[PDB]
């Protein structure tokens, strides 16, 4: 099993997507890639919000969970995701080693080439550190609330040619 | 990444313990062993209360996961677990392949042949079927409630000789 650690704005949009992609066995919402230990939903710092999505790598792969990613948020707003504003909405991806770095390098690469997304990728790729996970409030809200907040959704225009 | 399908009470409690198991990645709860298909909380048939746990082999493997269902609640019970009556709360072990069905025959041979437990063990021995999930209310609830209703508990004498 592998782990991935993605930050594309509101956590609960991110999970009720994410989860679904087959491949995937665990996902889990918080707070990561900030400053303050400890961190809330009220009192999380420089922290994003984020999602730790744990995968069987036989049945899904990285580069599969990056694509779903950039067609799932809109990775070109700076501090913003729809209509959630500020630094715990940012578009990020967090390494957990260095062929997740290179994939991620690559795979914003891919996305720039093909001119699909409205401007400039802005996400960050930094290496993982710690992961606050949220109140159990948080977790599976849009199991929950089906019909809850959400500003995620697929877009059939953002994907990449799938060359292999 | 290998997945383990037991019943043994009241799901709740289940998840609530079984979730804290180093090297289990993810639990989620249900209705299986039984009659009807799309079962739901007031409407199983004869399926019991159950727990689906996908764990990772290196880090835990299914005979600890079993040795602990064994500790958290009482197999020699029929129908019942503490104040829960009825089929909906009978201790199974559903096994995915034959190695689980070894595994769990030897695991309960040595739960006998140890004593320590009130009686013979009833637990059924199946193979796994339907695994109906459990509404979303039903999910990580004592997460959410941690105060919440439970009857399972480790037994510090509900342990067997570790000769591995
Ligand atoms: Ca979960
Ligand atoms: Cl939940």
Redesign the pocket.
């Known amino acids: 099993t592998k782990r991935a650690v993605l930050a594309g704005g509101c956590f609960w949009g991110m999970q009720d997507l994410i989860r679904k992609l087959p491949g995937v066995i665990e996902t889990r919402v918080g707070y990561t890639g900030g400053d303050v230990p400890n961190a809330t939903y009220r009192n999380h710092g420089t922290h994003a919000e984020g999602i730790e999505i744990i995968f069987d790598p036989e049945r899904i792969s990285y580069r599969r969970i990056l694509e779903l990613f950039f067609q799932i948020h809109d990775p070109t707003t700076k501090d913003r995701q729809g209509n959630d504003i500020g630094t715990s909405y940012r578009s990020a991806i967090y390494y957990v080693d260095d062929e997740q770095k290179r994939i991620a390098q690559e795979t914003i690469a891919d996305v720039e080439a093909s001119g699909l997304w409205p401007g400039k990728v802005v996400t960050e790729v930094e290496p993982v550190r710690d992961f606050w996970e949220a109140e ?2 948080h ?3 849009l ?2 609330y089906p019909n809850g907040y959400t500003c995620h959704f697929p877009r059939p225009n953002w994907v990449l040619p799938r060359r292999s």
């Open positions: 159990p409030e977790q599976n809200y199991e929950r």
